[PDB]
Amino acid sequence: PLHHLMIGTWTPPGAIFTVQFDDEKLTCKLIKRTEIPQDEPISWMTFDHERKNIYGAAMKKWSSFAVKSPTEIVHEASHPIGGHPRANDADTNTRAIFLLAAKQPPYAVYANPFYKFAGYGNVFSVSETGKLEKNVQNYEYQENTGIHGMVFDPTETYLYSADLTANKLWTHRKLASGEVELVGSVDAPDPGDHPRWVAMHPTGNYLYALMEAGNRICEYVIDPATHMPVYTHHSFPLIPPGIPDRDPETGKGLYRADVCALTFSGKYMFASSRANKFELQGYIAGFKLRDCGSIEKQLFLSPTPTSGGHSNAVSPCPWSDEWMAITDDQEGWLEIYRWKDEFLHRVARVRIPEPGFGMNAIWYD
Amino acid sequence: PLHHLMIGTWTPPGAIFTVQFDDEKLTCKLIKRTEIPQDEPISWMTFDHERKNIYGAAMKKWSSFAVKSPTEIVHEASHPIGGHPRANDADTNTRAIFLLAAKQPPYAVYANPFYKFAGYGNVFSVSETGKLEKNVQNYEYQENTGIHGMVFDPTETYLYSADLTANKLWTHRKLASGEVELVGSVDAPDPGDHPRWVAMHPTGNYLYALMEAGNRICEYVIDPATHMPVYTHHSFPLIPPGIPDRDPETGKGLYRADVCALTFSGKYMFASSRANKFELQGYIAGFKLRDCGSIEKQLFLSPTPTSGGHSNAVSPCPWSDEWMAITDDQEGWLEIYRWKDEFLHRVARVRIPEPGFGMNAIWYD
Amino acid sequence: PLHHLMIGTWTPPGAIFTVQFDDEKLTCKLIKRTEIPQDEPISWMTFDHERKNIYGAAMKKWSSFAVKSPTEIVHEASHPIGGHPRANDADTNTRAIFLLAAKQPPYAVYANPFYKFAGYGNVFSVSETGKLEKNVQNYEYQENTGIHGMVFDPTETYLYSADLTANKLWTHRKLASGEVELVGSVDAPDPGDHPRWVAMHPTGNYLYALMEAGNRICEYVIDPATHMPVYTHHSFPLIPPGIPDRDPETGKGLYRADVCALTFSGKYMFASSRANKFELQGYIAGFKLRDCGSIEKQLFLSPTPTSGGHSNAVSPCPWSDEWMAITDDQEGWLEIYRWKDEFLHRVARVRIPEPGFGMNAIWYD
Amino acid sequence: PLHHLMIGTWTPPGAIFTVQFDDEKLTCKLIKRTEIPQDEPISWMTFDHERKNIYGAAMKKWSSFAVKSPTEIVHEASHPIGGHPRANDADTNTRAIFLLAAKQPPYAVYANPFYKFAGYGNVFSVSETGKLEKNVQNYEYQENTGIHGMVFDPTETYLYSADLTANKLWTHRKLASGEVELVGSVDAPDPGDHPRWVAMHPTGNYLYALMEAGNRICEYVIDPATHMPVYTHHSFPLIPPGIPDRDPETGKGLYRADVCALTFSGKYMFASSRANKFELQGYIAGFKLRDCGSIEKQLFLSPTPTSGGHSNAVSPCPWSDEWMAITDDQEGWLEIYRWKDEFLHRVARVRIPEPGFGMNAIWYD
Ligand SMILES: O=S(=O)(O)CCN1CCN(CCS(=O)(=O)O)CC1
């Protein structure tokens, strides 16, 4: 049978690419390059609850597209970054970086600007058709903030945010209106961690926080009393222990962890990290999760084909543990791996020669 | 070399027995029966920070003894139960059940009455010689309370209490004066658990709560933000899974978990449970602890020689992982086991033919 | 439902006891004491392939009984020990010690005399009804031999013998006639091991040898080229590591490993050892087996209620992993345990006040 | 400090390359290209017992070179292939493929021709200086034979050969003279395995056989009675389980396992396999070994940068577990990895633009 993935880019000209994966022949083909606002390339895209819409973090905009089929994607809107007044000036580096679409009513979209003037979250309501409708709220974090990823508890009552630059994890309560309200925050275990991503276990008992500079996954149990994550002291490496990781000409790290995501069954989780130089390899890791939610063990830590560039984002098939996609913008590959007997093996891939190609892949089909 | 253990009884006449253990010949000899107030038998005794005093939960009294040597124990005082007015009436079943001696200044002693009218904790200051001096505070829990065990975090800033009858874990802050102040509480995971004991990991990261009726050890990570324990959803059986445990002429259970305690190194923990009928065997269990504090695995779950009676309390040597003592008041044995290559084997024992003998052993030497 | 076990004795008067086990009420009742030749007590009994006959190692005789039901056991024959001329003299200590009944045609019975003048095996053919018919062969080992246990490969083409006094393992080929023929032998790994028992993995890939004086189970892979066992260098303790085990008035050991047996599924194996002094505890151990036959891990090593006396023989239910029986002749109990979630718990037991009672239990029903 | 590795080629012009590795700066530099007989390129080289000589499998010759320093390598001799008459004809594909230098007196060299007319082994004595002196013996295997690797037991009394084309493992006894004598052989477990390489555990208890077409490591216990390897039924994958491995235009395998080798401490073993197409990744694997010799577990199975070409040979530092080198002749890299906390990470590498560069690396320094 055929499957389809959409992928965005880190650089203009903006476009959404549709790749087709044949799980029988085990091949990859680009079947469509859908043009979108030239200056609104999408570095992070996500589907709404019925995969009838695609929302994207697009440079200075939060865009919305209606999807009729893998090859019919129509731009329906592009909103500006809310919160701090200067977030939209074309002279500030503020950038739309992450986006999350609620799967339960009212299906609102929660978005995070990044870099300077990013001390707020942007909440958007959607129309009866799922189009990004109106910025209904700009809730504040702190002057310092740089959220790079969020996740809801299974009930979508609590929203957790990974604050990379403020080095902390925030907890918000989602009101019935879709609007949020602060509950609290916790600093990351170490000053050098820098939370970038967070994933949720299906029971709602555990949360996993990926530390970008710390290159590791930290385990959190969710306190039912407050709904806030508490560190269990368990962490796992996202880069080989002891690997040289300091740029001599910068003292800044050579590796930056990327993304973590659970597979369909909830029994596993894949994570990745990228290298800051093209001659270095990035890494991909796998974990097994106990039914109550704690991390049982790290199954693997292996080199990726490239440094991953700005990506190396892994994307598990939402309906089956069997497949996992990964994108890189160093060379521009969309690769597809098979998860079998707890070992990963590549089965197909395609290279897309375009500027900034390879930011993240999402499954439709 | 010779070692010594003191043991109390569940029944009058009160007496403190000193047993001698030769770790070379691997033998046990009773070398002293120290008489104490006939009606103040000690069902739970503990040493002060220098093992120069022995404090005991003695029926209707909290007694204090000065210890010059294994054979020289001298009664120095006996205080009444504080808190509820009727706790001391000779017609109420209130009983002094557990006692804890702080190892950091001001070396106060925290005691817990049990059964009816036990909604308070009793704090005692001690003299310059370590004698129970004065009841400086009677802090309240709830009318419902029945604390049967407590433990301090490594810093002795926070005191955790196992509330058996109220089915919860309490957290208190210890002020510099030695007095406490409520922080909060959490209900046990299940209505049928009934916390009876709590142990602390040396890092202060984890706490272990032994559930009496639930016959299991539940793991708690300590939230550094509040100092309160949060359940990780990990538990371990203290009786064989599936074993018939309902008395058919009571519907009440047949097993009651007893005590849990870490070994000298902090790498292991032993726990036990007793049977409510003399023809049934009690059990002893062993666990290995990761350096961060979580429980790595259960090493063993084995039958004890007797049902354990009201005891089966395990007592690891405080200075070496190698030895562990256990007492029972069904037959009256003080047994000593050796812990070697993660297997336990009995090496010596002695029986004491006296009424209620065998409640708990404490190491001096 | 009701189940039945038969048990013999180490001492006269000879008798076969039938115990009934109710797996619903979890109780034990002796329901029959079948008298047999007064001076032919059975220290080791086994059923034929249809459980229509019981064969026994009975002091100076190899006896045969027809079984119509749990309470109807009829003596049909008693043969003398074959091999060395003096084996049968009433003045020698030679004794019928072990017996094995083939489950494939011709259903012959293979028996081992023990102590002095025991350098031969005794093979008996059986009648059309399964009665011990005639000693068809007395095959030799060495003058030195003392076989205490044997086992066939799943095909019943090769017979392995545990030579305790010669400290070795023998391999024989079984001809179609039922008679054997030597293939070879191997010394036990250590001079102090003394093979006493051997069990076979269902695939025929592995064999387990229990060392009596070595108090351990040694793993053997069967070489398909020769059909002989080759030690893999893996062994497991049958008594706690480091436990004092040297009688200081003898220099001989304090513990003697007993028997090992696989459960119905072939996934597990239980083993036991006994203490040579009544005040010491014997032990029972459990192991998990990989599908290919190697021993994955030791699940437990626990004290038995008594020293086990001359027995402590464990007997897994042949049709279900759920139950296991053990006998002892110190106090005379037949105990029944349940195997659940890889933990063992006693569920019923009965004591039999007779001389030498408690040698081994076999399941009928 | 500085270290040095020598590497050969799969293709003419023949040359030995000396690469320098700085373990402080973690860099690689080619510091010498020593020219050798143009038509004698070395596809497999090895050092003698003091690293004063280098012996090579060089196309139609077995060459010998004296080594004064990393940059001073002097050709001292080239012998023809012994055994079958046509092995040396320039019109036959027979090729010198593997070589092994004894480390105990008389320090003979054992060599294996490959492809057609390779039914013999070639034994060479060495001069008082370690130069390949004279072919003292051409011992036979079978018509069919194709030994691709051998290994001695720690004592250098028994020589084991991996017969790839005859699909078996041979055992030879080494006489004091250095000459050998057949002991026996065993077919590989499966017809599709094809033994290519064998490694030895320091205790001499176990031997590991790498199956080329089977893409797996099979474990063998060495029978002390015969000195022959017996399969334990334990095997580990050298390519991901389930990965497509059939060339539709050939029915022939897409993957071919390569080499296996223990690290300095004997606690670990690395192995590899190569892909038959340049667009496929090869694999590297790591195993942990129990002290008795069995394989405890597979630590990792990860993709290599290239298909490995004809190589992907891994070469652990003989004096420290910390480093491992790997060569490939697809792109021509000599990479160096660090083994730390049981994870592997690349630390340095250099590419050599020459024909057939990258067959295997050996450490001097
Ligand atoms: O369940 S039952 O009532 O049948 C047996 C209970 N049983 C009686 C014997 N003792 C040992 C006493 S001593 O032998 O160590 O003195 C352990 C407990």
What is the count of structural domains for chain C?
A: 1
DSSP code of A87? Answer: G
Q: Is C221 on the interface with D (CB under 8 A)?
A: yes
Query: Which residues, at least 6 apart from C109, have a Cβ–Cβ distance to it below 8 Å?
Result: C48, C55, C62, C99, C100, C101, C102, C123, C124, C126, C132
Q: Environment class of residue C146 by beta-carbon count within 10 Å: exposed (0-12), middle (13-18) or buried (19+)?
A: buried
Q: Which of B306, B312, B330 to mutate to test the pocket of ligand 1 (most atoms within 8 A of CB)?
A: B306
> Which chains are adjacent to chain B, needing at least 3 Cβ pairs under 8 Å?
A, C
Distance CA D10, CA D40 (A): 10
Long-range contacts of D330-333 (CB under 8 A, 24+ apart): D330/D278, D330/D306, D330/D358, D331/D305, D331/D306, D331/D358, D332/D357, D332/D358, D333/D305, D333/D306, D333/D358
User: Is D148 designated active site?
Assistant: yes
Give the nearest chain D residue to C219 (CA atoms): D232
Q: How far A239 CA lies from chain D's nearest CA (Å)?
A: 9
Q: Specify the 3-state DSSP secondary structure of B116.
A: coil
The tokens for C87 are 């084996």
User: Is C256 designated active site?
Assistant: no
Nearest-CA residue for atom 9 of ligand 1? B306
DSSP code of C157? Answer: S
Distance CA B212, CA B255 (A): 8
CB B208 within 8 A of CB B199: yes
CB contact under 8 A, B300 and C302: yes
Q: Is B278 in the pocket of ligand 1 (CB under 6 A)?
A: yes
Distance CA D247, CA B232 (A): 50
The tokens for A341 are 């007997």
* Order of strands across the sheet that contains B313-316: B313-316, B323-327, B333-340, B343-351
Q: Which resolution, in Å, applies to this structure?
A: 2.5
Nearest ligand 1 atom, CA C305: 17
CB contact under 8 A, D341 and A300: no
Query: Which residues, at least 6 apart from D216, have a Cβ–Cβ distance to it below 8 Å?
Result: D193, D210, D235, D236, D237, D238, D257
Q: Is B350 in the pocket of ligand 1 (CB under 6 A)?
A: no
Q: Is C224 on the interface with B (CB under 8 A)?
A: no
Indicate which CATH number applies to the domain containing C107: 2.130.10.10
Distance CA B152, CA D159 (A): 64
Q: Give the distance from CA B156 to its chain's centroid.
A: 17
The tokens for D188 are 């590989």
From chain A, the residues in CB contact with D243 under 8 A are 338, 345, 347
Q: How far A204 CA lies from chain B's nearest CA (Å)?
A: 12
Query: Which residues, at least 6 apart from D185, have a Cβ–Cβ distance to it below 8 Å?
Result: D163, D168, D169, D170, D171
Of all residues in chain A, what percent are helix, strand and coil, respectively (each to 5)?
0, 55, 45
Query: Which residues, at least 6 apart from D262, have a Cβ–Cβ distance to it below 8 Å?
Result: D199, D200, D201, D202, D268, D269, D289, D316
Distance CA D6, CA D315 (A): 11
Give the nearest chain C residue to B345 (CA atoms): C240
Q: Is D240 on the interface with A (CB under 8 A)?
A: yes
Task: Tell me, in angstroms, the distance from the centre of ligand 1 to residue B303's CA.
Answer: 13
Distance CA B236, CA B295 (A): 9
Q: Is D243 on the interface with A (CB under 8 A)?
A: yes
Query: Which residues, at least 6 apart from C153, have a Cβ–Cβ distance to it below 8 Å?
Result: C160, C200, C204, C222, C227
Q: Give the distance from CA A266 to its chain's centroid.
A: 17
> Could you give the count of Cα atoms lying within 13 Å of A156 in the half-sphere of its Cβ?
16
Residue that is written with structure tokens 């003592």 in the block: B325
Give the nearest chain C residue to D231 (CA atoms): C223
Structural determination approach: X-ray
Q: Is D155 on the interface with C (CB under 8 A)?
A: no
Nearest ligand 1 atom, CA C351: 4
| Closest in A205, A230, A293 to B223, CB measured | A230
CB contact under 8 A, C232 and D232: yes
> Could you give the count of Cα atoms lying within 13 Å of D1 in the half-sphere of its Cβ?
3
CB C270 within 8 A of CB C288: no
> Which chains are adjacent to chain C, needing at least 3 Cβ pairs under 8 Å?
B, D
From chain D, the residues in CB contact with A241 under 8 A are 340-341, 343
Nearest to D184 by CA among D156, D204, D147, D159: D159
Q: What secondary structure does DSSP assign to D177-222, as a single string?
A: TS-EEEEEEEE-SSTT--EEEEEE-TTSSEEEEEETTTTEEEEEEE
Distance CA A309, CA A311 (A): 5
- Using DSSP bridges, classify how beta strands C229-237 and A206-211 pair: parallel, antiparallel or unpaired: unpaired
Domain that holds residue D112: 1-365
The tokens for B138 are 């009677």
Q: Is C225 on the interface with D (CB under 8 A)?
A: yes
> Could you give the count of Cα atoms lying within 13 Å of B166 in the half-sphere of its Cβ?
23
Residue C289 Rama label (left phi>0; alpha psi -120 to 50; beta): beta
Chain C to chain D, count of Cβ pairs less than 8 Å apart? 32
The tokens for C77 are 């024959």
Give the nearest chain A residue to D304 (CA atoms): A303
Q: Which of B278, B283, B352 to mutate to test the pocket of ligand 1 (most atoms within 8 A of CB)?
A: B278
Nearest to A10 by CA among A364, A352, A363: A352
Query: Which residues, at least 6 apart from C120, have a Cβ–Cβ distance to it below 8 Å?
Result: C82, C83, C84, C113, C138, C139, C140, C141, C145
For residue D125, give Cα distances in angstroms to D47, D132, D186: 15, 6, 28
Q: Is B349 in the pocket of ligand 1 (CB under 6 A)?
A: no
Q: Do chains A and B touch (3 or more CB pairs under 8 A)?
A: yes
Distance CA B188, CA B186 (A): 6
Q: How far D302 CA lies from chain A's nearest CA (Å)?
A: 6
Nearest ligand 1 atom, CA B330: 18
CA angle A34, A40, A46 (to 5 degrees): 70
User: Is D196 designated active site?
Assistant: yes
Query: Which residues, at least 6 apart from A169, have a Cβ–Cβ distance to it below 8 Å?
Result: A160, A161, A162, A163, A185, A186, A188, A195, A198, A209, A220, A229
From chain B, the residues in CB contact with A205 under 8 A are 233
Task: Tell me, in angstroms, the distance from the centre of ligand 1 to residue B309's CA.
Answer: 12
CB contact under 8 A, B346 and C26: no
Q: Is B331 in the pocket of ligand 1 (CB under 6 A)?
A: yes
CB B314 within 8 A of CB B339: no
The alpha-carbon radius of gyration of chain C (Å, integer) is 19
